[PDB]
Amino acid sequence: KYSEEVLDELRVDLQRRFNYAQGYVDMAVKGYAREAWEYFYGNLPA
Amino acid sequence: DALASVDGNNAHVEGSRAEDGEMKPTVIKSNVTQIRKVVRVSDTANTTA
Amino acid sequence: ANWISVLSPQDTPFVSMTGKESINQTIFSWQT
Numbered sequence: 001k002y003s004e005e006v007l008d009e010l011r012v013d014l015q016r017r018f019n020y021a022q023g024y025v026d027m028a029v030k031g032y033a034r035e036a037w038e039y040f041y042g043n044l045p046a
Numbered sequence: 047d048a049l050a051s052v053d054g055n056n057a058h059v060e061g062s063r064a065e066d067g068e069m070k071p072t073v074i075k076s077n078v079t080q081i082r083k084v085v086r087v088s089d090t091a092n093t094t095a
Numbered sequence: 096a097n098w099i100s101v102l103s104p105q106d107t108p109f110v111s112m113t114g115k116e117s118i119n120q121t122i123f124s125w126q127t
Contacts, residue, residue, distance in 0.1 A: 012119030
């Protein structure tokens with residue numbers, strides 16, 4: 001008996017949560033992980 | 047590279063000198079690469095729901 | 096001295112008395 005309005009509210013909440021989580025995690029981890037992988041093969045120093 | 051034209055008069059004599067042959071260089075070719083898009087948007091949103 | 100003094104007037108009763116609710120659009124609406 002799950003309502004579609006409940007699912008829409010859940011979708012909205014989850015979308016905003018994912019947006020915030022991405023905005024954080026990007027600069028928290030991936031901005032460093034990319035350059036770390038680049039240094040792994042020595043491709044960052046140009 | 048490209049081979050030379052085929053000869054049809056090879057009738058050299060016996061016990062003679064080794065005549066200088068036809069030798070040519072190998073032609074070389076080169077190229078270059080090419081280079082983006084624009085992501086113009088509002089972007090003031092997408093921070094809240 | 097290893098510290099700083101800051102008045103920091105931070106009553107903010109209204110913000111804690113009204114709660115909050117997330118949305119998914121820059122413009123929300125109700126009807127009543």
